[PDB]
């Protein structure tokens, strides 16, 4: 805590931290249940919304989607390259989640109503903080005291507990969740980067690109011991300023190092 005061300040801005050993049941909290933008992490969630739902619909994530160039918008490296052929549901969720493809995040949350239907399912499982108001990329405005679009670590981090490993989705669709997250290539530099290399890990990092505004959520299998579930936010009061990976990695560092792990 001290170390995560000390963290902040030499970052010029606010860290939020909020980490859970799912055996001891021991957590690490620090301004866990402030409000941090949530930028690109919701596109896990958004996967989630779209797991659930194919739960009692049957052939959703077989469901070919086709879109025009009006929807690439930057950021869809995935969605850019299958244009002419289209991409399923099942690979829409794949490139949002592993790339963080914002047409694919799009065209997803249109398909579950909304910021709102993806609100919404938030609610479903339980959890009252989260809200998304935009969809990609007005959601990254990340300006100070503005509550669109943001959630707590401590939400966060509750309720990826609840997809991955608790009984939120159903048994199939819970381990392929955890399967998309593992197979994440996009936050090398943060969580990912805190941890040893036999640990197994999964994650969906977020990226505003302003007022230091970054995070990643993170579910950690340490080896002989139950997993971790993680959430780390950053953000800070310019807009210029810059946000850092290498802040998010040591405070994860702080965080697994908290729970003796």
């Known amino acids: ?8 300040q030499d970052f010029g801005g606010s860290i939020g931290v909020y980490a859970m050993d799912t055996g001891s049941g021991a957590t690490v909290s ?8 949530l930028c690109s992490s919701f596109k896990g969630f958004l996967a989630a919304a779209v797991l659930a739902r194919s739960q009692q619909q049957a052939g959703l994530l077989d469901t070919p989607i086709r ?8 950021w869809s490296p995935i969605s850019e390259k299958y244009l002419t052929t289209g991409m399923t549901v099942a690979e829409l969720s794949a490139a949002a989640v592993q790339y963080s493809d914002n047409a694919a995040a799009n065209l ?5 109503g909304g910021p709102a239907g993806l609100t919404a399912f938030m609610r479903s499982i339980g959890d009252t ?3 998304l108001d935009r969809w990609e990329l007005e959601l990254n405005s990340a300006i100070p005291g503005d509550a669109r679009d943001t959630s707590s670590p401590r939400a966060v981090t509750e309720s990826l507990q609840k997809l991955t490993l608790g009984s939120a989705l159903a048994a199939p669709q819970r381990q392929q969740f955890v399967d998309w997250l593992k197979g994440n290539t996009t936050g090398n ?13 999964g994650d969906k990092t977020g990226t505003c690109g302003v007022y230091g505004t970054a995070n990643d ?6 080896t002989g011991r139950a997993p971790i579930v993680l959430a780390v936010y950053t953000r800070a009061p310019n807009k210029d300023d810059k946000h850092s990976e290498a802040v998010i990695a040591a405070a ?3 965080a697994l190092e908290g729970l003796g792990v």
């Open 1 to 8: 805590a001290e170390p995560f005061a000390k963290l902040e």
């Open 30 to 37: 620090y301004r866990a249940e402030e409000r941090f933008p």
């Open 67 to 74: 879109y025009g160039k009006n929807a690439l918008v930057p």
């Open 108 to 112: 997803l949350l249109k398909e579950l």
């Open 129 to 131: 903080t989260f809200r």
């Open 189 to 201: 530099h943060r969580i990912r980067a805190a941890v040893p290399a036999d640990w197994a890990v």
């Open 217 to 222: 959520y993170a579910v950690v299998w340490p």
């Open 252 to 254: 994860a560092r702080l």
